[PDB]
């Protein structure tokens, strides 16, 4: 990508920056002048960016991110260089691997994306790897604009113990979520953007839970839950047995087909009829 | 560049012109249009090209006005006020004080015409002119009247226009056979010395804020009566041509003079058959004057009388009261007031206008070029420049009460066998 | 302005897209006092957008037995009714073939159609269509569509303007308002479906230009 | 002292009195706040550099007011102290932001608002080099061209680049013999370190009515440098500030037989004069009774006509354009024709529309497509912009209709169901866009519209041309006698309040906002509820002498079904808008229609439609 559209992109300054809201886009302009970067070549492909910026790039940005409230900057990861041009991070290929198996749009039974990413781990196939990052990219942009938008319209339901959130089907990109793996992505990321645009001191502290529709035929959506976010949560979820309960005491139909037992599939109807038994049964 | 003047011409001769230069504060003092009265040394000039030939040049020092119409140097009721002398300002109070007014100045204005004591009336309150208002949007309400008239051969009907353009200051009279559409209006001309179109004012705009007289009004192409609507409707005068995009004020009031559809006028017919006028221009006008010459033996002794008077009487058979300069004054003075309408005569006028739409009413009668809206806007105006001539601050009954006379007997009554 | 190279020239045509990497530079010949000219030293250039199996389904296509109704259904997805209307166009795309007799004389190679009837907008929408999928074509209501004979203001003299018909290579012409084309153009069109070229001889022009394309026309 | 015996030009040229002005505007620019205890020159730098500007503005009464000499100084000799103010300036922001060295390094100090307005025609020798402020119209533009700044030869004996003069905008720069080999000959310059910078220049002129009372409009040039290029185009108002700065041309002198300078206006900073939160919208929206609140706030004087105001109405915010899936491309644009006899507040219509409305043009019909131009300016023959292209996403107002020629007939309705143009003109060939909805009022023929013929005869128009039209209201007069008065009244009322001795607020704010914050969907419950009326009323209507709704009026319902979206910000069809949406379609047809069958198809539908 470009160093531009990579900083709206990344869920980590898309929340400090609150590049969701005009007021503090300008902190985005604000960045880039302290560091002497022409708004002409940040907006350009990293790669034909001019060879005098990108000298000290990796310490000019941790240095004017003091500066404004980001001091984990800087993370401890690993590089791989094969030939002439090939320069991998090893958080380039996570992302284009778990956005190969995940594609929306679905060609045949669900085995056939598994045997596609499994394809592009081995360096006879890097045709596939340098395509799972077209896909990679456009959901990163597709994500950006859905935390937009329960942001801009305050769907985040401060039902009780937990938030409470949800999705609808007109607006655009949202057959990309349907799938019951790529939601918990877009959960965790809602979380953080949440829990540093909102004022409240409560709800700062309170665990999501998140459904989309699944299935129109069936009137189905699949429900998530995330730990209570912060900078050193134990990262001990706790929903697997609240909505085994739940469904246990409405007595509804349910589907724990999973490996994890966070996610579930769930009748239209019995929507209302989980939440407030759940609602009680958390207290 | 300057032009010898009218009366100097040798009889069968193109005038000639020089160049004066103008070289100091008196750098704008000039306009083209104007009678100015330059006073210099000639000199004598090289072409620089080749630095011979040489070529004269005036260079004027001052420049001013031939004459003036008030000799003392050359905008409000004071600042006029100021510059009358003690005989003018004794004899502008006299008149603004004098009572039947408005009836010795048609009587001194037209001095040698008999009759048609209704048209004299209508071109005075064009003279006078109405209220110009400005909308707050951005728009703007027409201030000034236009008349035209039509009538039988051998009527009067030029002679009306020459004295109203030879009293008048600043008024241009024109023909219609001999005009265009881009000398009314404006033109736009290549100077090629600056290589560019520039603009050139027209009759319409050279006349501003006076009284254009067009004669002979329904001789004009059909795409030349369409210009002049274009400016008779906005009071502007758009362009948009080969390099100039452009807007121009024109607050002109027209007084113009036809002829009926085959030489006489048919009084059988409405008025849209017995004239060649477009339609929508006969709608801006609001005031007509159809004369019409049913051979009277006893006129045809009067003006009979009349002209062989003034034919042995040269210079003479024209004692008027308020001689011709003196009226000049009187009307610079009375045209600077803006009359307010009273509560009263507020509703004296919504009342007339029910009494004059009902008239046209369905079938006792009959009239032509039926009565609209129009005519309302056309009452208040009539009545702000009546009362303007009385020197007056605002409207009473008296003024709306004979603004609405006139009107009533300017629309006539359709006739059949 | 560009200026393409000893490989670079004859490589796109008037009407392409193209993706531009030059040099931009000043021209050096030696409104203002210091101005020059510039133009960009094109030293790179792209542009943006038959087989054995697919040859086969054409092949198949041509052979099954409902072949004719296939194309005919597939021509006008929007507007329905009266398929004859769409069963006629479907061979104006095809035309005959060009015959040459031992004596030279030609015979045509293509098919007219008039869609009479009241302007109902009804058919710009398959003119707008039949233009659309076509190899070569054009629709039109400029220079005109015949050649014309202009005086130049440069030359001060008459130039020739070949319009749309010498243009169409074997395309096709829609029309509309066959009452509104200039009277002179008409007279010459109706000379160019005659004879299928176009020849002028005015004032210093004499020349010939082959129309070879298709007339599908809408009256009203 | 900062004053002492000397010329203004020469006094700041001194080491001494250039350093006191160099200290003294940095102690103004760090130290100045704004009746709220604000830097303002700490948050205003800071937002030129969240942009990357190089290019801060002082406006000229706060100058005068913390420092008293000078803004004294300053319109005397200009050409000096817009330079120290830019050393002083640049050594701040190089302060507040250390490392914007590596964007342009160079920065422009603007001034806003001089206190002495001027007019374009009295400008004289009293003035040459002297900072000024003037006003008018923009006739010209050329493109933006590069000019030399520091310009750097090379010599052709020896291999080495002369010295890096600089270029002044009066005379070509001269360089000396080599210093290496005293080769003086023809340099050329080296394309690799010569510096350049934008140029552009402009005509501009007089205010049409502004100062032009009686005489011929004036004009001057005026040079815009790098950062102010492109910051107006031909027909904008705005109002230079800039030096006033005298050529000596060699072409005048041999016109005008004497020696003649010419000038130029040195542009220092030009700003436009033309036309450019929710949570009341709410609720003023959710009223659900808007209509009638929204209908009598546009024709704000012209009494009656209620009916057309709807109909206008539902044009101005439009409906929506949607891109059908067949590739078909309706559009989304809704057009109106009216028609009546004079004298019925026709123009005034079209005139209220061009305020009330944004980015709208107006023309008569006594210019449509854009056409070849000898430039004033640089005297080339451009393309000029027409009258279609002007509106290319707003309204166009016609005006006189009727008198349009056969060129400009055959030229409208192309823009009508293509909405874009081509131009294969004497300059070149071009296809352009051009979306614009038409607001246009015809005149009837006799001088009278009468209504015993169909409408499509008191018209005067091209058949197939009233079919590009969505609406076709009919406007008539009256001599009812309750309505005289009430008439009458309002009229004398205006003429009352005016001469000297929903507002206008609300809506162009909401036709901003509803224009953007709306995209109406389109459901499938109604698809069926209209039927049953046009199987009914084609019959009805092709009973007798008259042609049935068809589908180019259904098109002009279904669009004006959007229409209502705008004023709700509804956006989802209903079955109640749809009783809107076919109640205008015919509406606008049963008006234009028979003697007898303008009132039998009202006895069928008026009392059928349940109205
Ligand atoms: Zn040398």
Redesign the interface.
Same mark, same amino acid.
């Given at each position: 990508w470009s160093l531009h559209d990579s900083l709206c992109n990344t869920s980590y300054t898309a929340a400090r920056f609150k590049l969701w809201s005009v007021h503090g886009q300008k902190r985005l302009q604000e960045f880039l002048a302290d560091m002497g970067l022409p708004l002409k070549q940040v907006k350009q492909k990293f790669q034909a960016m001019d060879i005098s910026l990108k000298e000290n790039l990796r310490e000019m940005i941790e240095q004017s991110a003091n500066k404004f409230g980001m001091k984990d900057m800087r993370v401890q990861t690993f590089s791989i260089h094969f030939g002439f041009k090939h320069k991998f991070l090893a958080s380039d290929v996570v992302f284009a691997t778990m956005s190969l198996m995940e594609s929306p749009e679905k060609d045949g039974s669900g085995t056939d994306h598994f045997i596609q990413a499994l394809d592009s781990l081995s360096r006879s196939n890097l045709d596939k790897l340098y395509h799972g990052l077209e896909l990679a990219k456009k959901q990163l942009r597709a994500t950006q604009q859905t935390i937009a938008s329960c942001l801009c319209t305050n769907l985040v339901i401060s039902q009780g113990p937990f938030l409470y959130c949800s999705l609808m089907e007109g607006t655009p990109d949202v057959m990309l979520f349907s799938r019951p793996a790529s939601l918990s992505l877009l959960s965790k990321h809602l979380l953080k953007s949440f829990v540093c645009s909102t004022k409240n001191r409560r709800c700062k502290l309170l665990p999501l839970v998140m459904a989309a529709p699944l299935s129109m035929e069936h009137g189905t959506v699949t429900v998530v839950g995330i730990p209570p976010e912060t900078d050193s949560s134990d990262r001990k979820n706790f929903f697997g047995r609240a909505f085994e309960k739940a469904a246990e005491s409405t007595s509804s139909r349910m589907l724990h087909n999973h490996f994890d037992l966070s996610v579930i599939e769930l009748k239209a109807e019995d929507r209302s009829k989980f939440l407030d038994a759940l609602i009680s049964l958390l207290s | 560049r300057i032009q010898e003047t009218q009366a100097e011409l040798p009889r069968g001769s193109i005038p000639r012109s020089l160049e004066v230069?103008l070289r100091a504060e008196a750098?704008?003092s000039a306009? +083209?249009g104007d009678k100015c009265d330059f006073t210099g040394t000639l000199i004598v000039?090289? @072409?620089? #090209?080749k630095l011979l030939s040489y070529r004269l $040049?005036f260079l004027a020092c001052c420049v001013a006005p031939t004459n003036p119409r008030f000799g003392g140097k050359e905008q409000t009721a004071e600042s006029i006020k100021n510059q009358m002398t003690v005989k003018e300002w004794e004899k502008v109070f006299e008149m603004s004080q004098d009572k039947n007014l408005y009836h010795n100045l048609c009587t001194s204005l037209f001095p040698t015409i008999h009759g048609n004591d209704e048209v004299k009336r209508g071109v005075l309150l064009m003279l006078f002119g109405g209220?110009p208002?400005?909308?707050?949007?951005?728009?703007s309400?027409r201030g000034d009247i236009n008349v035209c008239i039509v009538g039988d051969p051998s009527t009067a009907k030029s002679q009306f226009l020459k004295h109203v353009e030879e009293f008048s200051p600043r008024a241009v009279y024109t023909s219609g056979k001999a005009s265009s559409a881009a000398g009314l209006t404006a033109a736009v001309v290549r100077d090629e010395?600056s290589?560019?179109? $520039?603009?050139? +004012?027209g009759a319409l705009m050279?006349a @501003?804020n006076g009284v254009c007289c067009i004669d002979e009004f329904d001789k004009m192409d059909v795409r030349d009566q369409? +210009?002049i609507?274009?400016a008779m409707?906005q009071q502007?005068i #758009?362009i948009?041509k080969?390099?100039?995009?452009?807007?121009?004020?024109a607050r002109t009031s027209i007084l113009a003079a036809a002829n009926p559809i085959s030489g006489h006028y048919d009084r059988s017919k409405s008025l849209?058959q017995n004239i060649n006028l477009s339609?929508?221009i006969?709608?801006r006008f609001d005031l007509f004057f159809i004369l019409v010459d049913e051979c009277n033996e006893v006129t045809d002794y009067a003006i009979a009388r009349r002209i062989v008077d003034l034919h042995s009487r040269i210079e003479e058979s024209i004692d008027r009261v308020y001689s011709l300069d003196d009226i000049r004054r009187y009307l610079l003075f009375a045209r600077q007031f803006?009359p307010?309408?009273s509560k009263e005569s507020?509703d004296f006028?919504?009342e007339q206008?029910?009494h004059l739409?009902?008239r @046209?009413?369905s079938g006792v009668t009959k009239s032509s070029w039926r009565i609209?809206?129009?005519q309302?806007?056309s009452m208040?105006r009539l009545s702000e420049a009546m009362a303007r001539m009385h020197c007056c601050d605002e409207v009473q009954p008296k003024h709306v009460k004979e603004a609405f006379r006139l009107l009533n007997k300017s629309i006539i009554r359709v006739e059949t066998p | 302005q560009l200026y393409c190279d000893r490989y670079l020239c004859d490589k796109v045509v008037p009407g392409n897209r193209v993706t531009i990497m030059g040099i931009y530079s000043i021209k050096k010949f030696g409104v203002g006092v210091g101005i020059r000219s510039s133009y960009i030293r094109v030293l790179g250039i792209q542009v943006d957008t038959v087989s054995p199996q697919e040859e086969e389904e054409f092949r198949r296509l041509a052979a099954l037995p409902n072949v004719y109704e296939v194309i005919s259904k597939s021509i006008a997805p929007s507007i329905f009714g009266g398929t004859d209307m769409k069963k006629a166009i479907a061979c104006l795309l095809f035309g005959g073939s060009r015959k040459r007799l031992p004596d030279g004389l030609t015979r045509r190679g293509d098919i007219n159609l008039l869609m009479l009837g009241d302007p109902g907008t009804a058919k710009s929408q398959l003119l707008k269509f039949v233009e659309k999928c076509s190899p070569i074509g054009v629709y039109t209501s400029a220079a005109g569509l015949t050649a014309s004979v202009m005086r130049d203001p440069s030359s001060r003299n008459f130039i020739m303007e070949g319009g749309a018909m010498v243009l169409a290579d074997g395309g096709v012409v829609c029309i509309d308002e066959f009452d509104k084309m200039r009277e002179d153009d008409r007279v010459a069109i109706h000379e160019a479906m005659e004879q299928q070229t176009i020849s002028i001889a005015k004032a210093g022009i004499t020349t010939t230009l082959n129309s070879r394309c298709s007339v599908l026309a809408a009256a009203n | 002292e900062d004053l002492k015996g000397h010329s203004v030009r020469e006094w700041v040229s001194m080491a001494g009195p250039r350093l006191e002005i160099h200290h003294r505007f940095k102690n103004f620019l760090r130290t100045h706040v704004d009746s709220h205890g604000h830097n303002v020159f700490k948050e205003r730098i800071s937002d030129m550099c969240k942009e990357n500007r190089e290019s801060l503005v002082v406006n000229y009464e706060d100058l005068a007011a913390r420092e008293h000499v000078l803004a004294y100084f300053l319109p005397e000799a200009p050409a000096e102290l817009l330079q120290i103010f830019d050393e002083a300036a640049l050594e701040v922001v190089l302060a507040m932001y250390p490392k914007y060295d590596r964007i342009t390094n160079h920065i422009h100090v603007r001034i806003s608002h001089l206190p002495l307005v001027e007019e374009l025609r009295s400008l004289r020798q009293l003035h040459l080099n002297q900072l000024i402020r003037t006003s008018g119209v923009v006739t010209s533009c050329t493109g933006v061209l590069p000019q030399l700044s520091m310009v750097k030869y090379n010599c052709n004996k020896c291999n080495f680049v002369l010295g890096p003069f600089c270029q002044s905008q009066n005379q070509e720069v001269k360089p000396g013999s080599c210093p290496e080999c005293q080769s003086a000959g023809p340099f050329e310059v080296n394309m690799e370190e010569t510096i350049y910078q934008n140029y552009q220049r402009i005509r501009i002129q007089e205010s049409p009515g502004k100062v032009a009372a009686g005489r011929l409009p004036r004009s001057k040039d005026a040079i815009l440098l790098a950062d102010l290029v492109d910051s107006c185009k031909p027909g904008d108002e705005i109002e230079l500030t800039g030096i006033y700065h005298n050529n000596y041309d060699g072409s005048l002198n041999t016109a005008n037989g004497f020696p003649v300078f010419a000038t130029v206006i040195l542009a220092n900073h030009v700003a436009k004069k033309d036309n450019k939160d929710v949570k009341m919208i709410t609720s003023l929206s959710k009223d659900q009774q808007i209509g009638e609140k929204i209908f009598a706030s546009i024709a704000p004087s012209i009494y009656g006509h209620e009916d057309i105001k709807r109909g206008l109405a539902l044009a101005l915010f439009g409906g929506e354009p949607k891109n059908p899936g067949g590739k078909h491309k309706v559009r989304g644009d809704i057009n109106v024709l009216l028609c009546g006899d004079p004298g019925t507040a026709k123009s005034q219509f079209l005139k209220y529309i061009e305020k009330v409305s944004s980015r709208a043009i107006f023309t008569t019909g006594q210019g449509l497509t854009a056409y070849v131009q000898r430039h004033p300016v640089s005297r080339e023959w451009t393309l000029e912009a027409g009258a279609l292209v002007l509106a290319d996403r707003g309204v166009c107002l016609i005006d006189e209709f009727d008198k349009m020629n056969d060129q400009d007939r055959t030229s409208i309705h192309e823009a009508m169901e293509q909405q874009s143009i081509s131009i294969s003109k004497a300059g070149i060939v071009t296809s352009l866009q051009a979306r614009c909805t038409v607001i246009a009022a015809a005149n009837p023929i006799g001088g009278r519209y009468d209504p015993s013929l169909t409408f499509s005869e008191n018209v005067d128009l091209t058949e197939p041309i009233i079919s590009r039209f969505d609406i076709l209201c009919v406007v008539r007069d009256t001599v009812d006698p309750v309505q005289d008065e009430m008439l009458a009244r309002f009229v004398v009322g205006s003429h009352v309040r005016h001469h000297p001795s929903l507002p206008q607020e609300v809506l162009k704010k909401y036709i901003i906002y509803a224009k953007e914050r709306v995209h109406p969907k389109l459901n499938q419950m109604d698809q069926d509820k209209v039927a049953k009326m046009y199987s009914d009323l084609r019959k009805e209507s092709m009973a007798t002498g008259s042609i049935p709704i068809t589908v180019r009026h259904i098109e002009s319902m279904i669009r004006m079904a959007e229409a209502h979206a705008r004023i709700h910000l509804r956006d989802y069809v209903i079955e109640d808008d749809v009783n809107m949406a076919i109640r205008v379609m015919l509406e606008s047809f049963i008006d234009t229609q028979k003697f007898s069958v303008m009132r039998s198809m009202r006895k069928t539908f008026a009392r059928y439609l349940s109205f």
């Open positions: - | 230069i750098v704008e306009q +083209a000039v090289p @072409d620089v #090209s $040049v209220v208002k400005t909308t707050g949007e951005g728009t309400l010395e290589h560019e179109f $520039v603009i050139e +004012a050279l @501003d369409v +210009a609507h274009e409707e502007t #758009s948009t080969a390099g100039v995009k452009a807007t121009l004020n849209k339609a929508p006969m709608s803006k307010k309408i507020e006028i919504v206008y029910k739409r009902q @046209d009413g609209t809206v129009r309302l806007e208040i | - | -």
